[PDB]
Copies of this chain bind each other. A is one copy, B any other.
Amino acid sequence: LTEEQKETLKKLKLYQKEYYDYESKFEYELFLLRQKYHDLYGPIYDKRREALVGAKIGTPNLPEFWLRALRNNNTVSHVIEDHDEEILVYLNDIRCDYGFILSFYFATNPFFSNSVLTKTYHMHTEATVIDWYDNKNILRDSFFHFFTSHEMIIEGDYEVALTIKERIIPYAVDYYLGII
């Protein structure tokens, strides 16, 4: 490069650093916005859970609520089998916290002892190991294979998790009603 061109390059480096200054502020203000609204969604999720749950069955105030919400979603329905349903009726709540952790809360059930099954996504995955009771391990294909720590396996797994996080949890009752 000539010196005149080096000067132009110099200017462009200055302006690019300025762009990064602003983009930083944007990402920071974006993080603030997402966090603010996560905490505003919190009580709504709490109220929903309270209304659904209040028994030795899941969501006893509205039986099979989460199963039917999950079933009415295209992406998630693919991974849910007949035999899975008799476990998923014990589901009390599905939660998300900040990657992120998905928590599935279960009423006392004859399949496993866990009251909570978690799945963490770091951006590897971390999943609670299901403490299956004797002759109760339904695992052939299952939704519960989702609960493994760890690209085909990792992608369809992530897509279901994203759907739960971004669609099921925010719009649960609309899936239940079948209007999405």
A residues sitting closer than 8 Å to B (CB atoms) are 1, 4-5, 8-9, 11-13, 15-16, 18-19, 22-23, 25-26, 29-30, 33, 37, 40-41, 44, 47-48, 51-52, 61-63, 170-174, 176
The answer to whether A52 touches B8, judged by C-beta atoms less than 8 angstroms apart, is yes
With the chains together, A125 CA to B9 CA distance in Å? Answer: 35
Q: Which residue of B lies closest to A174 (CB)?
A: B16
In the bound complex, residues from chain B placing their C-beta under 8 Å from that of A61 are: 4-5, 8
Mostly, the A contact residues are helix
Cβ-defined partner of A44 (8 Å) among B1, B19, B44: B19
Residues from chain B with a CB closer than 8 A to the CB of A173 are 9, 12-13, 15-16
Contact A22 B41, CB 8 Å, known A15-B47, A30-B33, A173-B13: yes
